Amino acid sequence: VPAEGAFTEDFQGLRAEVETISKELELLDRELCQLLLEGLEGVLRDQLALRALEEALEEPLDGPAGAVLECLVLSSGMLVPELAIPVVYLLGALTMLSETQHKLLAEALESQTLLGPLELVGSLLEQSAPWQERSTMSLPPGLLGNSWGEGAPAWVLLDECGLELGEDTPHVCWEPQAQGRMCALYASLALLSGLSQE
Amino acid sequence: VPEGAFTEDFQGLRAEVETISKELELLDRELCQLLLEGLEGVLRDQLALRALEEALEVEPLDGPAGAVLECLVLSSGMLVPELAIPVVYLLGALTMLSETQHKLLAEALESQTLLGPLELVGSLLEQSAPWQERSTMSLPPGLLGNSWGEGAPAWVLLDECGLELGEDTPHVCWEPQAQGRMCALYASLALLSGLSQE
Numbered sequence: 001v002p003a004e005g006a007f008t009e010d011f012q013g014l015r016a017e018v019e020t021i022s023k024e025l026e027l028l029d030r031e032l033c034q035l036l037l038e039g040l041e042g043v044l045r046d047q048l049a050l051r052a053l054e055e056a057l058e059e060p061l062d063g064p065a066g067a068v069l070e071c072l073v074l075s076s077g078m079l080v081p082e083l084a085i086p087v088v089y090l091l092g093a094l095t096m097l098s099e100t101q102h103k104l105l106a107e108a109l110e111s112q113t114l115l116g117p118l119e120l121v122g123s124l125l126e127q128s129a130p131w132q133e134r135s136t137m138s139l140p141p142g143l144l145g146n147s148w149g150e151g152a153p154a155w156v157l158l159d160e161c162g163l164e165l166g167e168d169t170p171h172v173c174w175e176p177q178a179q180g181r182m183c184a185l186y187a188s189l190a191l192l193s194g195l196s197q198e
Numbered sequence: 199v200p201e202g203a204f205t206e207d208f209q210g211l212r213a214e215v216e217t218i219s220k221e222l223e224l225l226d227r228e229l230c231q232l233l234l235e236g237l238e239g240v241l242r243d244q245l246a247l248r249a250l251e252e253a254l255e256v257e258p259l260d261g262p263a264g265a266v267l268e269c270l271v272l273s274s275g276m277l278v279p280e281l282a283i284p285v286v287y288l289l290g291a292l293t294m295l296s297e298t299q300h301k302l303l304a305e306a307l308e309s310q311t312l313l314g315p316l317e318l319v320g321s322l323l324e325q326s327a328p329w330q331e332r333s334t335m336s337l338p339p340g341l342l343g344n345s346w347g348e349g350a351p352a353w354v355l356l357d358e359c360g361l362e363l364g365e366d367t368p369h370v371c372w373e374p375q376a377q378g379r380m381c382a383l384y385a386s387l388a389l390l391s392g393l394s395q396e
Contacts, residue, residue: 063209063210
C-alpha cells in the first residue's frame with residue numbers, strides 16, 4: 001500500500017538507468033563530443049566554473065563553463081534539451097563527489113583512461129550487492145591493470161567514496177555508506193565514457 | 199545571489215591582456231616605432247608620464263609625453279579611441295609599478311629585450327596560481343637565459359614586485375602580496391612586446 005517496491009536498485013537497474021542517457025551521447029557527432037570533453041575536463045578542474053555551468057542551465061560565459069555551454073546552445077541560446085539534459089544528469093552526479101574526485105576525473109579525461117576505473121567501480125558495485133550489507137571483497141584492482149597502492153588514482157577515487165582500502169588482501173571492503181558516491185562515480189565515468197569515443 | 203569569484207587564473211589574465219595586445223599587433227610598423235620612442239622616454243621621466251596620463255585624462259606637449267600624443271591624436275588634433283585606449287591600458291598598469299621598474303622597462307625597450315622577462319614573469323604567474331596562497335617555486339631564472347643575482351635587471355623587477363629572491367634554491371618564493379604588481383608588470387611587458395614584433 002505505501003509504495004510499489006523496494007528502496008534500492010541493483011547494479012543492472014543502475015546500469016540501465018545510466019545507459020539511456022549514455023545512448024543519447026553515444027549517438028552524436030565526434031566533433032561535438034571532442035568539444036564537450038575539452039570543456040568538461042576544464043570544468044572538473046575549476047569548481048567555480050562547475051557551479052557556473054550548473055547555474056547557467058537554470059547567455060554566454062567565459063572559460064570552461066562557457067565552452068561546455070557552446071556545445072548545448074543555439075545562436076542566440078536557446079539551450080537545447082536533447083543535449084543539455086544529458087549534461088545536467090552528469091552535473092547532478094558530480095555534486096555527490098569530492099573536489100579531489102573531480103580532478104581525478106579531469107586526469108582520466110586528459111590521459112583518455114576512463115574505462116579502467118569504470119570497469120573497477122562498475123565491478124565493485126556489481127559484486128557489492130546487496131549494497132546495504134557491509135562485506136569484504138576478493139577483487140584486487142591491480143589484476144585488472146590499474147595502479148594500486150595509497151597514492152594511485154583508482155585508490156583515491158575509491159577512498160573518497162568511503163571504502164576501506166588495503167595494499168594487501170582484502171584490498172576492498174564495502175561500506176553501505178559509500179553507495180551514494182560509488183553510484184555517482186560509476187555514472188560520471190560512464191557518461192564521460194559515452195562521449196569518448198569509444 | 200551577491201555571480202563569479204574574485205581572482206583570475208593566468209589564462210584569464212593572459213586573455214584579457216591579449217584583447218588589447220592584438221589591436222597593437224594590427225597597427226602599422228612606422229607608428230609602432232614612433233610610439234616606443236616616446237614611451238621609452240616617458241618611462242625614463244616620471245613627470246612626463248604623469249602629463250601623458252593627464253593629457254589623455256588635446257593640446258600638444260613638449261618632450262617624450264608629446265611624442266606619444268602625436269601618435270594618438272594627429273594631425274587634427276583630438277583623441278582617436280582606437281589608438282588611445284591601448285596606451286591608456288598600458289598607462290594604467292604602469293601606475294602599479296615603481297620608478298625603478300619603469301627605468302628597467304625603458305632599458306628593456308632600448309635593448310629590445312622584452313621577451314625574456316615577459317617569459318619570466320609570465321611563467322611565475324602561471325605556476326604560482328592559486329595566487330592567494332604563499333608557496334616556494336622551483337623555477338630558476340638563470341636557466342631561462344636571464345641574468346640572475348642581487349643586482350640583475352630581472353631580479354630587481356621581481357624584487358620591486360615584493361617577491362623574496364635567492365641566488366640559490368629556492369630562487370623565487372611567491373608572496374600573495376605581489377599579485378597586483380606581477381600582473382601589472384606582466385601586462386606592461388606584453389603590451390610593450392606586442393608593439394615591438396617581438
